[PDB]
Amino acid sequence: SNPTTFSVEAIAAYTPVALIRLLNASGPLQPGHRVDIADARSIYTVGAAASAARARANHNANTIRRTAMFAETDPMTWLRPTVGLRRTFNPRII
Amino acid sequence: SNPTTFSVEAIAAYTPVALIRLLNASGPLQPGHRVDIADARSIYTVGAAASAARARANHNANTIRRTAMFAETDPMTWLRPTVGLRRTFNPRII
Amino acid sequence: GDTGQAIPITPHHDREWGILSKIYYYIVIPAFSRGSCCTMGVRYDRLYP
Amino acid sequence: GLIMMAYQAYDETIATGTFFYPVPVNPLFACPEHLASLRGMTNARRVLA
Amino acid sequence: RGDTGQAIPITPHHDREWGILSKIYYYIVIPAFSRGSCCTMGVRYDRLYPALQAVIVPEIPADEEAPTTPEDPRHPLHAHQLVPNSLNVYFHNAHLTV
């Protein structure tokens, strides 16, 4: 978090990027300044995806561990089934 | 129950097998260890059958004992044969 | 399986995949579209973000 | 045993190696599609006969 | 209607009608307006005869009724008993209750 210090775009920027619902990209820019650019693009998304996967963090008091969905052994298989999911229910805990 | 002491699978294992909510078969195994194996499967049998045969105990506070299923003698039958149920009534004793 | 690195590639589906896919794409699609449908490639770099 | 019409094997909800096996048996049915049994070998039995 | 003994005895079970009409769709109905889908095999008997478990619900709740309609969380066919291992999440790939 500190210091990088905060993505202003600019081309610093920093890899995480631990925000969510960011009305920042647009937002003003305004526009991008005089630097090279190339990635930039990659370092943006590679962190943006994590900043939503980490943005979940919670909602896991409402999930639901995943399961095998599909599966494979499952080191026993010999006295007990192995099959998994298709996820067409709803996980919500109320 | 004690001591056998607890089925870890392993190939001990023990005949009943007097649990409910077994997150156990899997669970980890992980996998079955270095033993010959074969039964196992049947010692698993007569015990997993007990594992809910005994685990009934309750759910007779809602029943609904059986019926003669069908009828034939039926030690009287001379003024009184029968038929055993099919009881679509939704049985809960309430 | 394990995705791994040394494990070589295997078909996801058996050969009837090829036959059914070819029949579909080369008969049913042209029969309905009647030469209006077009085939294109995507811009993943502009889609995923 | 059992009988069965047509199902799904290129494949994404159900197993192998626990509770099923081929049979081609008792003659008046015609089943083109059980392409999926028993592996480690050549290319032999679906595009030679 | 049986009681113990050693061999209970020879005469026809059911006998000679139910034999020609039911097994009389074996000649009669399926693979040709079909164009032929029904495919038959014998078994070996283990993923229903040694393995089908898991034991987790609470009772059907205490001492009342049982209508139908499908909504929200407390239950067996509910994933509070459905991740994978029982019969339950197993069970709903499609759309229904228990």
Coordinates of C-alpha atoms in Angstrom, one line a residue:
Chain A
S1 CA 0.0 0.0 0.0
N2 CA 2.6 2.5 1.1
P3 CA 4.5 3.8 -0.5
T4 CA 4.0 3.4 -4.2
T5 CA 1.8 5.3 -3.5
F6 CA -1.6 5.2 -5.3
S7 CA -2.4 4.6 -9.0
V8 CA -3.0 7.9 -10.7
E9 CA -2.2 6.8 -14.3
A10 CA 0.7 7.9 -14.7
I11 CA 2.6 4.7 -15.7
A12 CA 4.1 3.8 -12.3
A13 CA 1.7 2.3 -11.3
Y14 CA 1.9 -0.5 -8.7
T15 CA 0.9 -4.1 -9.0
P16 CA -1.7 -4.4 -6.2
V17 CA -4.2 -2.4 -6.6
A18 CA -6.4 -3.4 -3.7
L19 CA -9.5 -1.4 -4.4
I20 CA -13.0 -2.3 -5.7
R21 CA -15.9 -0.6 -7.5
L22 CA -13.3 2.0 -8.5
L23 CA -15.0 4.9 -10.3
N24 CA -11.4 6.0 -10.9
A25 CA -10.4 4.9 -14.3
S26 CA -13.3 6.9 -15.6
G27 CA -13.1 9.0 -13.6
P28 CA -10.6 11.5 -14.9
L29 CA -7.2 10.6 -16.4
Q30 CA -6.9 13.2 -17.9
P31 CA -5.3 11.9 -20.2
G32 CA -2.3 9.7 -19.7
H33 CA 1.0 11.5 -19.4
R34 CA 4.3 11.4 -21.4
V35 CA 5.7 8.0 -20.7
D36 CA 6.4 4.9 -22.9
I37 CA 3.5 2.5 -22.1
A38 CA 3.2 -1.2 -23.0
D39 CA 2.4 -2.9 -19.7
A40 CA 0.9 -0.9 -18.1
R41 CA -1.8 -3.0 -19.7
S42 CA -0.7 -6.4 -18.4
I43 CA 0.3 -5.2 -15.0
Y44 CA -3.1 -3.5 -14.8
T45 CA -5.3 -6.5 -15.4
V46 CA -3.1 -9.1 -13.6
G47 CA -3.7 -7.0 -10.5
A48 CA -7.3 -6.0 -11.2
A49 CA -8.4 -9.6 -11.3
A50 CA -6.7 -10.2 -7.9
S51 CA -8.3 -7.0 -6.6
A52 CA -11.7 -8.6 -7.2
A53 CA -10.7 -12.1 -6.1
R54 CA -9.4 -10.5 -2.9
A55 CA -12.4 -8.1 -3.0
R56 CA -14.6 -11.2 -2.4
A57 CA -12.7 -12.2 0.8
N58 CA -16.1 -11.9 2.5
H59 CA -19.2 -13.3 0.8
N60 CA -17.5 -16.4 2.1
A61 CA -19.7 -16.2 5.2
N62 CA -22.3 -16.9 2.6
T63 CA -20.4 -19.5 0.5
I64 CA -19.8 -22.6 0.4
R65 CA -16.5 -24.2 0.0
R66 CA -16.2 -25.2 -3.7
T67 CA -16.1 -28.9 -4.4
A68 CA -14.5 -31.0 -7.0
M69 CA -17.3 -29.9 -9.4
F70 CA -15.7 -32.5 -11.8
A71 CA -13.4 -34.9 -10.0
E72 CA -10.8 -37.6 -10.0
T73 CA -9.5 -40.0 -7.3
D74 CA -10.0 -39.0 -4.4
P75 CA -7.6 -41.5 -2.9
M76 CA -10.2 -44.0 -1.8
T77 CA -12.8 -44.6 -4.4
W78 CA -12.9 -48.2 -3.4
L79 CA -15.7 -48.3 -0.9
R80 CA -17.3 -44.9 -1.5
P81 CA -18.2 -42.9 -4.6
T82 CA -16.4 -40.1 -6.2
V83 CA -18.5 -37.7 -8.2
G84 CA -18.8 -33.9 -8.1
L85 CA -21.0 -30.9 -8.9
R86 CA -22.7 -28.8 -11.4
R87 CA -23.4 -25.6 -9.7
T88 CA -27.0 -24.8 -10.4
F89 CA -28.1 -24.1 -6.8
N90 CA -27.8 -20.8 -4.9
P91 CA -25.4 -20.3 -2.0
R92 CA -26.8 -17.7 0.5
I93 CA -26.7 -18.7 4.2
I94 CA -29.5 -16.3 4.9
Chain B
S1 CA -17.0 -48.3 20.6
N2 CA -14.0 -48.3 22.8
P3 CA -11.5 -49.5 22.2
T4 CA -11.3 -50.5 18.5
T5 CA -11.0 -47.5 18.4
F6 CA -12.0 -45.3 15.4
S7 CA -12.1 -46.2 11.7
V8 CA -9.4 -44.2 10.0
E9 CA -9.1 -46.5 7.0
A10 CA -6.6 -48.1 7.6
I11 CA -7.9 -51.7 7.2
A12 CA -8.7 -52.5 10.9
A13 CA -11.4 -51.1 10.7
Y14 CA -14.0 -52.2 13.2
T15 CA -17.4 -53.9 12.7
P16 CA -19.8 -51.1 13.8
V17 CA -19.3 -48.2 12.7
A18 CA -21.7 -46.4 14.9
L19 CA -21.4 -42.8 13.7
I20 CA -23.5 -40.2 11.9
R21 CA -22.3 -37.2 9.9
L22 CA -19.2 -39.0 8.6
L23 CA -17.1 -36.4 6.9
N24 CA -14.8 -39.4 7.3
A25 CA -14.6 -41.8 4.4
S26 CA -13.7 -38.6 2.7
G27 CA -12.4 -36.6 4.3
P28 CA -8.8 -37.5 3.7
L29 CA -7.7 -41.1 3.5
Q30 CA -5.1 -40.3 2.3
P31 CA -4.8 -42.9 0.7
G32 CA -5.4 -46.3 2.2
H33 CA -2.2 -47.6 3.8
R34 CA 0.0 -50.6 3.1
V35 CA -2.3 -53.5 4.0
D36 CA -3.7 -56.4 1.9
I37 CA -7.4 -55.2 1.6
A38 CA -10.5 -57.2 0.4
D39 CA -12.8 -57.0 3.4
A40 CA -12.7 -54.1 4.5
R41 CA -15.7 -53.9 2.2
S42 CA -17.9 -56.4 4.1
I43 CA -16.8 -55.5 7.6
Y44 CA -17.7 -52.1 6.2
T45 CA -21.0 -53.7 5.2
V46 CA -22.5 -55.1 8.4
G47 CA -21.4 -52.0 10.2
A48 CA -22.6 -49.3 7.9
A49 CA -25.9 -51.1 8.0
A50 CA -25.9 -50.7 11.8
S51 CA -24.8 -47.1 11.3
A52 CA -28.4 -46.1 10.5
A53 CA -30.3 -49.2 11.7
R54 CA -29.3 -48.2 15.2
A55 CA -29.4 -44.5 14.2
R56 CA -33.2 -44.7 13.8
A57 CA -34.1 -44.7 17.5
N58 CA -36.0 -41.5 16.8
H59 CA -38.3 -41.1 13.8
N60 CA -40.4 -43.6 15.6
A61 CA -41.9 -40.6 17.4
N62 CA -43.4 -39.7 14.1
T63 CA -44.3 -43.2 12.8
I64 CA -46.6 -45.2 11.9
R65 CA -45.8 -48.7 12.7
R66 CA -46.0 -51.2 9.8
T67 CA -48.9 -53.1 8.5
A68 CA -49.3 -56.8 7.5
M69 CA -48.0 -55.5 4.2
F70 CA -50.3 -58.1 2.7
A71 CA -52.7 -60.6 4.2
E72 CA -52.9 -64.3 4.5
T73 CA -53.4 -66.2 7.7
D74 CA -53.5 -64.1 9.8
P75 CA -54.3 -66.5 12.6
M76 CA -58.1 -66.0 12.4
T77 CA -59.1 -65.5 8.8
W78 CA -62.3 -67.4 9.6
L79 CA -64.2 -64.2 10.0
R80 CA -61.3 -61.9 9.5
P81 CA -58.7 -61.6 6.8
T82 CA -56.9 -58.3 6.1
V83 CA -55.0 -56.2 3.7
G84 CA -51.7 -54.6 4.6
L85 CA -51.3 -50.9 3.9
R86 CA -50.5 -48.7 1.2
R87 CA -50.8 -45.4 3.1
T88 CA -50.5 -42.3 1.0
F89 CA -51.3 -40.4 4.2
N90 CA -48.5 -38.1 5.0
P91 CA -47.2 -39.7 8.2
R92 CA -46.0 -37.5 11.1
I93 CA -48.1 -38.3 14.2
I94 CA -47.9 -34.5 14.6
Chain C
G1 CA -5.3 -35.7 -14.4
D2 CA -2.5 -33.5 -13.4
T3 CA -2.0 -30.8 -16.0
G4 CA 1.7 -31.0 -15.5
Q5 CA 4.4 -30.5 -18.1
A6 CA 5.7 -33.9 -19.1
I7 CA 2.2 -35.4 -19.5
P8 CA 1.4 -35.2 -23.3
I9 CA -1.8 -34.0 -24.8
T10 CA -4.8 -36.3 -25.2
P11 CA -8.1 -35.6 -27.0
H12 CA -10.9 -34.2 -24.9
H13 CA -13.5 -36.2 -26.8
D14 CA -13.5 -39.2 -29.1
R15 CA -13.5 -39.2 -32.9
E16 CA -17.3 -38.7 -33.1
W17 CA -16.6 -35.2 -32.0
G18 CA -15.0 -34.5 -35.4
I19 CA -17.9 -36.0 -37.4
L20 CA -20.7 -34.3 -35.5
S21 CA -18.9 -30.9 -35.4
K22 CA -18.2 -31.0 -39.1
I23 CA -21.7 -32.0 -40.0
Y24 CA -23.2 -29.3 -37.8
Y25 CA -20.9 -26.5 -39.0
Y26 CA -21.0 -27.4 -42.7
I27 CA -24.7 -28.2 -43.0
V28 CA -26.9 -26.9 -40.3
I29 CA -25.3 -23.5 -40.0
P30 CA -25.2 -22.7 -43.7
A31 CA -28.7 -24.1 -44.1
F32 CA -30.1 -21.5 -41.7
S33 CA -27.8 -18.6 -42.1
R34 CA -27.8 -18.9 -45.9
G35 CA -24.5 -17.3 -46.4
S36 CA -25.1 -14.4 -44.0
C37 CA -23.0 -15.6 -41.0
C38 CA -19.4 -14.6 -40.9
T39 CA -16.4 -16.1 -39.0
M40 CA -14.1 -13.9 -36.9
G41 CA -11.4 -13.9 -34.4
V42 CA -11.6 -12.1 -31.1
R43 CA -9.4 -9.4 -29.4
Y44 CA -8.7 -11.0 -26.0
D45 CA -6.4 -8.1 -25.0
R46 CA -9.4 -5.8 -25.4
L47 CA -11.9 -8.1 -24.0
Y48 CA -10.5 -9.6 -20.7
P49 CA -9.9 -6.2 -19.1
Chain D
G1 CA -28.3 -55.7 -15.2
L2 CA -29.7 -52.8 -17.2
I3 CA -30.6 -51.2 -20.5
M4 CA -30.0 -47.7 -21.8
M5 CA -30.8 -45.5 -24.8
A6 CA -28.4 -42.6 -25.4
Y7 CA -26.5 -40.4 -22.9
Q8 CA -23.4 -38.2 -22.5
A9 CA -19.6 -39.3 -22.6
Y10 CA -17.5 -36.5 -24.2
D11 CA -17.7 -36.0 -21.0
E12 CA -18.6 -33.7 -17.9
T13 CA -20.8 -35.1 -15.0
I14 CA -20.4 -39.0 -14.5
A15 CA -17.7 -41.5 -13.8
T16 CA -15.9 -44.6 -15.0
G17 CA -14.6 -47.7 -13.2
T18 CA -17.3 -48.3 -10.6
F19 CA -20.7 -49.2 -11.9
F20 CA -21.1 -49.9 -15.6
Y21 CA -19.9 -52.0 -18.5
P22 CA -20.5 -52.8 -22.2
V23 CA -22.5 -55.7 -23.6
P24 CA -23.9 -55.7 -27.1
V25 CA -26.8 -58.0 -26.3
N26 CA -30.0 -59.5 -27.4
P27 CA -30.7 -59.1 -31.0
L28 CA -33.3 -56.6 -31.9
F29 CA -31.8 -53.2 -31.0
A30 CA -29.4 -50.9 -33.0
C31 CA -26.9 -48.9 -30.8
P32 CA -24.3 -46.7 -32.5
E33 CA -23.0 -44.6 -29.6
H34 CA -21.2 -46.2 -26.6
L35 CA -17.8 -45.0 -27.6
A36 CA -16.3 -45.0 -24.2
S37 CA -15.0 -48.0 -22.1
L38 CA -11.3 -49.2 -21.4
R39 CA -7.9 -47.4 -22.1
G40 CA -4.1 -47.9 -22.8
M41 CA -3.6 -49.1 -26.4
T42 CA -3.6 -48.3 -30.2
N43 CA -6.4 -46.8 -32.5
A44 CA -8.0 -50.1 -33.4
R45 CA -11.7 -50.7 -33.0
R46 CA -13.7 -47.5 -34.1
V47 CA -11.9 -46.5 -37.6
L48 CA -10.6 -50.2 -38.8
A49 CA -14.0 -52.2 -38.6
Chain E
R1 CA -46.9 -65.1 4.8
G2 CA -44.1 -67.5 5.6
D3 CA -42.8 -69.3 8.7
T4 CA -39.7 -71.2 9.2
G5 CA -39.1 -74.8 8.2
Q6 CA -36.3 -76.0 5.7
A7 CA -37.3 -75.9 1.9
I8 CA -41.1 -74.6 1.3
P9 CA -42.4 -76.6 -1.6
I10 CA -42.7 -77.3 -5.3
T11 CA -45.7 -76.1 -7.4
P12 CA -45.9 -73.2 -9.9
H13 CA -45.1 -69.7 -8.7
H14 CA -47.0 -67.4 -10.7
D15 CA -47.6 -69.6 -13.4
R16 CA -48.9 -69.5 -17.0
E17 CA -50.4 -66.0 -17.9
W18 CA -48.2 -63.1 -16.8
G19 CA -45.5 -64.9 -18.9
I20 CA -46.6 -64.0 -22.5
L21 CA -48.0 -60.4 -22.3
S22 CA -45.5 -58.4 -20.2
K23 CA -42.4 -59.9 -21.5
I24 CA -44.8 -59.2 -24.6
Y25 CA -43.3 -55.8 -25.4
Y26 CA -39.9 -58.1 -26.2
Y27 CA -41.3 -58.6 -29.0
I28 CA -43.4 -55.3 -28.9
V29 CA -42.1 -51.6 -28.2
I30 CA -39.1 -49.2 -28.9
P31 CA -35.9 -49.1 -31.3
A32 CA -37.4 -47.9 -34.7
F33 CA -39.6 -45.0 -34.6
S34 CA -36.9 -44.9 -32.2
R35 CA -34.5 -45.8 -35.0
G36 CA -33.1 -47.8 -32.2
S37 CA -31.8 -46.2 -28.8
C38 CA -32.4 -48.7 -25.9
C39 CA -29.1 -50.3 -25.0
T40 CA -29.0 -53.4 -22.5
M41 CA -26.3 -54.6 -20.1
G42 CA -25.9 -56.8 -17.1
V43 CA -24.1 -55.5 -14.1
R44 CA -21.6 -56.1 -11.4
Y45 CA -23.1 -54.9 -8.3
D46 CA -21.0 -52.2 -6.7
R47 CA -21.8 -48.4 -6.6
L48 CA -25.5 -49.3 -5.2
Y49 CA -24.7 -52.8 -3.3
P50 CA -21.2 -51.8 -1.5
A51 CA -20.9 -47.7 -1.2
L52 CA -24.0 -45.3 -1.2
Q53 CA -23.6 -42.9 2.0
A54 CA -23.7 -39.9 4.0
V55 CA -25.6 -39.2 7.3
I56 CA -26.1 -35.5 8.3
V57 CA -29.6 -33.9 8.5
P58 CA -31.8 -33.0 11.4
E59 CA -35.1 -34.7 11.8
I60 CA -37.9 -33.6 9.7
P61 CA -38.9 -30.9 12.1
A62 CA -40.8 -31.7 15.1
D63 CA -44.4 -32.9 14.9
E64 CA -46.1 -31.2 11.9
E65 CA -47.0 -31.2 8.2
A66 CA -45.4 -31.5 4.8
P67 CA -46.5 -29.4 1.7
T68 CA -44.4 -28.7 -1.4
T69 CA -43.2 -25.3 -2.6
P70 CA -39.4 -24.7 -3.1
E71 CA -37.5 -21.7 -1.5
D72 CA -34.8 -21.0 1.2
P73 CA -32.0 -22.2 3.6
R74 CA -32.2 -24.9 6.3
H75 CA -32.1 -28.3 4.9
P76 CA -30.9 -31.7 3.6
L77 CA -31.4 -31.3 -0.2
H78 CA -30.1 -27.9 0.9
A79 CA -26.5 -27.6 0.8
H80 CA -26.4 -27.3 4.6
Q81 CA -26.3 -30.9 3.5
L82 CA -24.9 -30.8 -0.1
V83 CA -21.2 -30.4 -1.0
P84 CA -20.3 -33.8 -2.3
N85 CA -20.9 -37.0 -0.2
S86 CA -24.3 -38.3 0.7
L87 CA -26.9 -38.4 -1.9
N88 CA -27.9 -34.8 -1.9
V89 CA -25.9 -32.2 -3.9
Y90 CA -25.5 -35.4 -5.9
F91 CA -29.0 -35.5 -6.2
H92 CA -30.3 -31.6 -8.1
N93 CA -28.4 -30.9 -11.3
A94 CA -32.1 -30.2 -12.6
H95 CA -35.0 -28.3 -10.6
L96 CA -36.9 -29.8 -7.5
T97 CA -37.2 -30.6 -3.7
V98 CA -37.3 -33.5 -1.0

